[PDB]
Design a binder for this molecule. Structure first.
Ligand SMILES: O=C(Nc1ccc(C(=O)N[C@H]2c3cccc(O)c3C[C@@H]2C(=O)O)cc1)NC1CC1
Length: 167
């Protein structure tokens, strides 16, 4: 049993809710919240910008030190950093950004990072300002992630479309 509330069950292991991932993280304090990161961990907008704002920029400060030491992530890769006031840990995962021409096949590799964590709160990777089709992202999620994932979809119209079109 876990504290995630109001989710629709899509499969054995994937759950979905119309919710602001920031507000959901603040309320559940999950072990892992996933950030929709870029390779530079520059949390300017979209989900990343929102999560970072909720940490009063502490996520960005920590991220800048990480990059200065380790260099950029790979598209499809991830790193575990602090969850600050939102979660125990933040898994920063880089999905391909279609508005940069990145290969959409890398989306499966990005979701594979979730399998290193038993339970996660997450957005749909490569959705929103990353330019991919969220219906496709949900399909890849379901077909790749085997651990227990609680997906937060900010837009109600999109949430309803994702549920109603789910096979
Ligand atoms: O701003 C906020 N929350 C806030 C929450 C989510 C987003 C956002 O863009 N999410 C989408 C995104 C962005 C980038 C890549 C992606 O794959 C996705 C899928 C995500 C989705 O479809 O849900 C933006 C803002 N809270 C403050 C207190 C009011």
């Amino acid at each position: 049993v876990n504290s995630f509330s109001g989710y629709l069950k899509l499969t054995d292991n994937v759950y979905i809710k119309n919710a602001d991932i920031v507000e959901e993280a603040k309320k559940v304090k999950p072990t892992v919240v996933v950030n929709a990161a870029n390779v530079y961990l520059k949390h300017g907008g979209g989900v990343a910008g929102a999560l970072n704002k909720a940490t009063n920029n502490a996520m960005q400060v920590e991220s800048d030190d990480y990059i200065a030491t380790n260099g950029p992530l790979k598209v499809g890769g991830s790193c575990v950093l602090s969850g600050h006031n939102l979660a125990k840990h933040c898994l920063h995962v880089v999905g391909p950004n279609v508005n940069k021409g990145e290969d959409i096949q890398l989306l499966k590799s990005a979701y594979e990072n979730f399998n290193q964590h038993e339970v996660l709160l997450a957005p749909l990777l490569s959705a929103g300002i990353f330019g991919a089709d969220p219906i496709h992202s949900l399909r890849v999620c379901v077909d790749t992630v085997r651990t227990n994932v609680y997906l937060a979809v900010f837009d109600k119209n999109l949430y309803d479309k994702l549920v109603s079109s789910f096979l």
